[PDB]
């Protein structure tokens with residue numbers, strides 16, 4: 001029986017992966033040709049967004065100009081989208097994952113497998129946790145992970161890229177690779193899911209810093225320095241936060257050095273951070289004016305990491321991460337991004 | 344007896360390091376105020392370059408719009424600049440290094456120390472030969488290495504950056520660190536000089552690859568994959584050809600990941616590779632046309648690497664390095680750069 005795929009989310013990345021999945025499932029027996037996608041209903045240009053997608057095959061708000069396959073069906077009722085799904089693709093901004101999980105918690109088939117593409121970490125009453133763990137604890141299903149150098153708009157343009165699937169049960173990781181891989185979307189599967197997921201979260205901190213330096217007209221040598229110092233802070237953080245071993249090797253997968261590079265040159269965090277450094281407006285204000293409903297995560301993540309590093313007594317060892325937080329939230333002059341590199 | 348410093352070379356990067364050394368020397372009791380710099384003599388606007396530098400204090404041809412300190416003295420005579428030298432900074436395009444040592448072998452104090460900033464490798468009889476060894480064997484002095492994310496035009500503008508000094512005798516490495524460092528030029532000293540040097544050479548192959556992808560208008564995701572795949576090939580080459588064990592950590596210094604980023608985004612190899620892809624002119628043509636006497640190392644290094652790898656039956660393990668060679672010299676269609684990222 002062909003495997004029914006359901007996409008929870010439909011934003012910039014959500015839509016680009018719906019395009020990928022739509023065309024892939026059409027050419028494999030293993031996967032059901034109809035792909036259900038949950039769309040948080042919005043009215044755009046006087047019309048329900050689900051209707052725009054189903055009738056015109058385009059998410060006009062979050063992926064303008066890119067046609068989606070007709071076999072992707074938008075759905076406003078999360079429950080109806082979820083029931084009967086064999087594969088669940090969680091591709092939604094971190095700040096909505098809680099409300100979505102405990103809406104479908106126990107209304108999904110017991111045997112189903114999920115993959116999370118969400119970049120962020122969850123701060124809750126029990127502390128800092130991987131988003132994947134929240135989905136595990138609340139859904140009771142196996143969860144793999146997909147993180148890589150995947151700027152959505154370039155993927156939708158069918159430009160070559162790579163990504164990393166992390167999966168503690170390797171056969172599940174390989175199934176998702178069959179679902180998602182493309183000649184221009186090359187996938188490596190590794191077992192260290194936590195380090196893969198954590199890379200995708202932390203890299204957005206470094207992108208905000210990188211964007212600040214662009215605001216100061218610093219150039220390529222400085223940005224490379226920021227990327228490199230940032231990567232070292234990512235590894236050092238993982239060694240502390242992570243359960244058991246953490247191999248440097250994982251940081252050389254797409255999820256690590258590669259995602260850090262594209263995000264710091266072409267990501268949305270970078271662009272808003274540069275605007276912050278030049279205009280003196282607030283992040284929140286710039287987010288609303290610049291991104292047409294799309295969601296940053298770099299600053300929020302910087303705040304969560306800063307808190308845990310402060311609790312652990314370790315801020316002095318993480319000058320780059322702490323600088324990004326203090327410039328975002330505590331009025332530290334943006335010029336001091338340069339300062340914390342120097343010493 | 345304050346140490347007398349001398350620079351062999353005067354191009355884009357040489358003028359930049361000569362700017363740096365001129366300032367740091369005046370402000371340090373350890374180092375002699377006046378700095379001899381060897382300039383291969385040329386006619387610019389009807390005048391000897393040497394005369395331009397010494398009268399106007401500006402290498403108008405290779406580092407235009409930056410004043411070189413008055414205490415840096417241009418010298419046409421290579422023997423003069425060299426005799427009495429304590430510290431020797433070697434910063435010349437790789438192709439000329441044989442001609443240089445042949446002319447000044449046994450004309451330098453035996454007590455003197457030298458450092459190589461040259462990026463590339465040399466054609467040897469039993470495979471891989473490093474430029475630093477060709478300098479050691481002919482000059483008979485200790486040779487340190489300096490490699491990092493150092494686009495000269497940005498360094499000269501005093502934009503923040505890092506480099507890595509590679510140094511088998513650490514005291515030597517530490518000396519050149521006191522000489523060369525500034526608040527905007529942060530130096531780390533490591534003792535695995537060969538890997539550091541080898542990163543410097545190989546990264547220019549990846550940059551030609553990245554330039555080609557830019558030529559095909561591939562985007563940031565694709566470039567991040569090229570950098571990433573290039574880095575793995577760099578590590579894999581070093582593990583095979585370096586004398587002794589090679590640590591991953593070395594590649595996370597500025598000479599590794601950082602130089603790869605800055606070079607693939609802002610370097611001269613990338614820029615000419617992009618032109619190669621778009622115009623269909625030859626590499627040599629575009630060098631003469633675009634760089635006003637400045638020199639590429641990327642293609643040449645790729646040919647040197649190709650011959651080593653062919654002889655040893657290793658071409659299959661380095662598809663990125665091989666593709667770059669084949670596009671540059673064997674008329675392989677440039678669009679096949681992508682093809683070999685997919686496999």
Ligand SMILES: NC(=O)c1ccc[n+]([C@@H]2O[C@H](COP(=O)([O-])OP(=O)(O)OC[C@H]3O[C@@H](n4cnc5c(N)ncnc54)[C@H](O)[C@@H]3O)[C@@H](O)[C@H]2O)c1
Nearest residue numbers: 010011012013014040091092093096118119151152294295
């Ligand atoms: N876009 C990219 O270039 C890119 C690339 C790789 C990974 N990612 C990651 O993918 C994840 C998803 O991001 P995206 O780009 O698809 O989303 P997005 O930031 O582009 O878009 C916002 C989405 O939020 C949803 N939304 C807004 N309010 C909501 C509410 N109250 N309840 C439920 N949903 C609501 C909307 O449906 C909308 O589609 C993020 O973790 C992001 O970091 C993004």
Ligand SMILES: NC(=O)c1ccc[n+]([C@@H]2O[C@H](COP(=O)([O-])OP(=O)(O)OC[C@H]3O[C@@H](n4cnc5c(N)ncnc54)[C@H](O)[C@@H]3O)[C@@H](O)[C@H]2O)c1
Nearest residue numbers: 353354355356357383434435439461462493494495637638
């Ligand atoms: N320019 C940079 O941004 C940069 C940065 C870091 C490292 N490097 C590396 O450092 C080294 C130095 O390069 P550069 O930028 O100073 O050189 P360059 O290519 O910019 O300049 C060419 C120079 O070569 C010399 N030259 C030309 N013909 C010669 C000949 N017939 N005989 C002797 N000398 C001749 C000239 O003196 C001229 O100044 C290279 O290995 C380069 O790859 C360059």
Ligand SMILES: [Cl-]
Nearest residue numbers: 408409410411
């Ligand atoms: Cl100047």
